[PDB]
Amino acid sequence: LQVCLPKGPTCCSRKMEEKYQLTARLNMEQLLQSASMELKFLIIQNAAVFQEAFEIVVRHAKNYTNAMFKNNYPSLTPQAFEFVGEFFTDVSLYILGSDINVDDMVNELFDSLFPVIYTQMMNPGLDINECLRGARRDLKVFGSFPKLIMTQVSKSLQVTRIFLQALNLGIEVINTTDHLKFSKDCGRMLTRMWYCSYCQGLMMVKPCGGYCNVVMQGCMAGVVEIDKYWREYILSLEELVNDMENVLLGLFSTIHDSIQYVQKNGGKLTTTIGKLCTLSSRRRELIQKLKSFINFYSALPGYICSHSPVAENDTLCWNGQELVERYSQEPVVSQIIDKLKHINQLLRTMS
Amino acid sequence: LPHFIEEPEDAYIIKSNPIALRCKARPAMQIFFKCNGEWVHQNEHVSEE
Numbered sequence: 510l511q512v513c514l515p516k517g518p519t520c521c522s523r524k525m526e527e528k529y530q531l532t533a534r535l536n537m538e539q540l541l542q543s544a545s546m547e548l549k550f551l552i553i554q555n556a557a558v559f560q561e562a563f564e565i566v567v568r569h570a571k572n573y574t575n576a577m578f579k580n581n582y583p584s585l586t587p588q589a590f591e592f593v594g595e596f597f598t599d600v601s602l603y604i605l606g607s608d609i610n611v612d613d614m615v616n617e618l619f620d621s622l623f624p625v626i627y628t629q630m631m632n633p634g635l636d637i638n639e640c641l642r643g644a645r646r647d648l649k650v651f652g653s654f655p656k657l658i659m660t661q662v663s664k665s666l667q668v669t670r671i672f673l674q675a676l677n678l679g680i681e682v683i684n685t686t687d688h689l690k691f692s693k694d695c696g697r698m699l700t701r702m703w704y705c706s707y708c709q710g711l712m713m714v715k716p717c718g719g720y721c722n723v724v725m726q727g728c729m730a731g732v733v734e735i736d737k738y739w740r741e742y743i744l745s746l747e748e749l750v751n752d753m754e755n756v757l758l759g760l761f762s763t764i765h766d767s768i769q770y771v772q773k774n775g776g777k778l779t780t781t782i783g784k785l786c787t788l789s790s791r792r793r794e795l796i797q798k799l800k801s802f803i804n805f806y807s808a809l810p811g812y813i814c815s816h817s818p819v820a821e822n823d824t825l826c827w828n829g830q831e832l833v834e835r836y837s838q839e840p841v842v843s844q845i846i847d848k849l850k851h852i853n854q855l856l857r858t859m860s
Numbered sequence: 861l862p863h864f865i866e867e868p869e870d871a872y873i874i875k876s877n878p879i880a881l882r883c884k885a886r887p888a889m890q891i892f893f894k895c896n897g898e899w900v901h902q903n904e905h906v907s908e909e
């Protein structure tokens with residue numbers, strides 16, 4: 510035998526020992542999944558809810574901008590609907606983590622907005638379109654309005670994007686916990702602690718609490734080191750929650766004022782161009798529920814021993830090799846800690 | 861059975877320009893569209909005899 514230390518005779522062969530090892534693997538993975546399920550479902554639910562809530566906010570803001578275009582500038586529709594839809598589509602794509610340039614969103618918005626303003630509002634009456642698009646930026650027709658919107662929306666959209674990325678990475682590490690493969694030495698120690706008693710012909714004998722403690726602190730030496738970074742992750746997320754609804758909803762007022770500003774200099778502009786051409790409650794409840802799991806990695810071996818059958822009295826128990834009266838007495842983890850360090854730096858730099 | 865003469869071709873919307881779908885069959889007395897599993901409202905259909 511290579512796991513079961515044969516002190517007397519033995520009722521199990523090498524193949525039964527391999528079966529016990531695989532059942533030990535399955536039992537450990539199931540215990541980790543049961544430990545991580547509540548927190549995993551919490552973060553998954555909140556990620557989904559916040560995603561839907563942000564999409565609702567973006568849709569409502571696009572609807573409000575379209576409605577104020579319908580009401581105040583009917584001459585700009587239906588072209589106004591095209592560039593508003595493209596703008597808020599790129600907004601949502603940026604919120605959901607896609608490579609979108611915020612400055613490019615605002616600049617394409619004003620680039621599309623200026624030619625229809627010139628053709629329908631200032632000089633009523635397809636190839637000359639690009640000359641107007643160039644003149645928009647060359648003559649700075651919109652003044653400081655584009656940079657104002659640029660900073661106003663970049664500030665909120667970056668914090669929202671990093672909030673969603675942080676939720677997703679928390680899901681990732683919590684998903685990794687229950688798929689953490691362990692050492693072979695730990696496999697043999699778990700097999701001895703849970704099953705090798707059956708090879709010696711014992712039916713209901715449980716391992717000693719102290720033996721479970723030494724085994725668990727033996728193979729979770731790496732996993733426990735994640736606790737510092739997980740605590741810093743929780744606290745940095747708390748730092749970030751302490752923003753985007755008001756900005757996207759005031760966008761229509763800002764754009765309306767910018768259109769007024771451009772119409773203010775129409776006299777010179779037409780001649781020159783003719784010649785030239787409950788959310789905050791949710792994130793608060795999420796952080797208050799997430800702070801209940803700050804001890805997750807430090808309490809994990811305690812969970813494995815308190816949910817595995819053990820003799821807490823440490824009397825008439827299995828010590829891994831014999832029935833005693835009293836008890837005598839990683840690459841994936843590195844990746845988890847690396848991504849936690851990265852997301853924590855990103856969080857702290859944001860707030 | 862009804863034989864389709866002009867089968868509807870996959871359309872693409874460009875710059876928010878709504879492009880209609882054509883359908884012509886003989887012998888046919890009623891021709892309707894089933895977009896994404898469900899029937900299209902009677903008002904949307906424009907029949908030609």
Ligand SMILES: *[C@@H]1O[C@H](CO)[C@@H](O)[C@H](O)[C@H]1NC(C)=O
Binds near residue numbers: 878879880881906907
């Ligand atoms: C919509 O229906 C009318 C009537 O049959 C037709 O004239 C037109 O081409 C259709 N438009 C589109 C977008 O297919």
